């Protein structure tokens, strides 16, 4: 029943006061984009940075298996938008947050489906 839990290990290293994963690939873009979370091209709005997806995926970056049956990555080959105030830790952000399945924004960071 043993499985490595890297998500939990990273969250705990962050809480311990560890330096977040660096060298996430930040893109140049207009910053007039839709602001959605994970897109086929950079979509950062005025409050977001856009990064190359693979460089922000914990499983990609650590060379470990993706936690799902067929091991698919939903960041690789896409761009992930990160609020500018959290862009110092894109990996942590994507791991600790969730995408609204209806509007495509980050829940709590642009998703307005609950007001």
């Amino acid at each position: 029943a043993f499985a490595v839990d890297a998500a939990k290990a990273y969250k705990d290293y962050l809480a311990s006061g560890g330096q977040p994963i660096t060298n996430c690939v930040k893109m140049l873009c207009t910053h007039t984009g839709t602001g959605q979370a994970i897109t086929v091209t950079p979509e950062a709005n005025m409050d977001q940075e856009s990064f190359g997806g693979a460089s922000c995926c914990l499983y990609c970056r650590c060379h470990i298996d993706h936690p799902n049956p067929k091991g698919f990555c939903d960041l690789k080959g896409k761009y992930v938008q990160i609020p500018t105030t959290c862009a110092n830790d894109p990996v942590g952000f994507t791991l600790k947050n969730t995408v609204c399945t209806v509007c495509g924004m980050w829940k709590g960071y642009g998703c307005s489906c609950d007001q």
Partner: protein, 298 residues
């Protein structure tokens, strides 16, 4: 220097026509740095400006475009250049990248290993190479044409580049190859392009635009590299990141360029003219299959 608002500077045609002898490269602005936008890597800025310049050429952009990117890994195990290529190329473009060292990538498929172990069944529409051997910068021995990965690259162009396809191959003062220059004469047009962000470096991208498969002009590769160094030595390029701030027209324009399969005997002067204008790709359109040769030992 209205050049500072361009993505970079291309080698003027009058310098291509010279017959200079090879001198040491000595750049006036050597050691200056452009100031990059906050938190932007050199490799992202550099590939952005490369793509911005390529937007001004007659690149063939077919449906289901095929792009292969050599030398794509970084020292930190990611692929910034590939990420700019994915951003630039039309959605759905098949992008394959490769490097000697392990890295994680946004490309559709990645091969790890020396490029000489890379084989593909299909032909490609655009070949990008950032490969560079840092051992090559030995200032105390003569600067002769280098082989290594350049031998692979010339063969790869000749065998696996679609007619009408294009290339961009990084060179420097000491990392260069006479046959690659001579191959530039097999395209409808060619240049050496220096990005404004890295203009303090002798690096350039040798760009071949619209491959024709036959010599259109004869080019002496030893002379042409000497011409390139002469141009660089006498034409200081002001470092600049200006173009990085306007990305509104960055994406490569979807041209829907026609793909045809043709045998060597039916490529007339009329087809050659279509190729030369970026309006025709000649290759099959089967499945894209790639592999890496693995040597087995104890």
């Amino acid at each position: 220097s209205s050049q500072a608002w361009q993505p970079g500077v291309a080698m003027p045609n009058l310098y291509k026509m010279q017959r200079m002898l090879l001198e040491k490269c000595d750049l006036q602005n050597y050691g200056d740095s452009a100031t990059l936008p906050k938190g932007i890597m050199m490799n992202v800025a550099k590939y952005t400006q490369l793509c911005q310049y390529l937007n001004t050429l007659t690149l063939a952009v077919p449906y289901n475009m095929r792009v292969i990117h050599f030398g794509a890994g970084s020292d930190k195990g990611v692929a910034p250049g590939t990420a700019v290529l994915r951003q630039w190329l039309p959605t759905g473009t098949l992008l394959v990248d490769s490097d000697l060292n392990d890295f994680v990538s946004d490309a559709d498929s990645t091969l790890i290993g020396d490029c000489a172990t890379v084989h593909t069944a299909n032909k490609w529409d655009l070949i990008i190479s950032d490969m560079y051997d840092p051992k090559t910068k030995n200032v105390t021995k003569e600067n002769d044409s280098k082989e290594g990965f350049f031998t692979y690259i010339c063969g790869f162009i000749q065998q696996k580049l679609a007619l009408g396809g294009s290339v961009a191959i990084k060179i420097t003062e000491h990392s260069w190859n006479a046959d690659l220059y001579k191959l530039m004469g097999h395209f409808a047009w060619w240049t050496a392009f220096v990005t404004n962000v890295n203009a303090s470096s002798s690096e350039a991208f040798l760009i071949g635009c619209n491959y024709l498969g036959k010599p259109r002009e004869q080019i002496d590769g030893y002379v042409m590299h000497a011409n390139y160094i002469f141009w660089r030595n006498t034409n200081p390029i002001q470092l600049s990141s200006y173009s990085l701030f306007d990305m509104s027209k960055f994406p490569l324009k979807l041209r829907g360029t026609a793909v045809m399969s043709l045998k060597e005997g039916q490529i007339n002067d009329m087809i050659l003219s279509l190729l030369s204008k970026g309006r025709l790709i000649i290759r099959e359109n089967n499945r894209v299959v790639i592999s890496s040769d693995v040597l087995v030992n104890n």
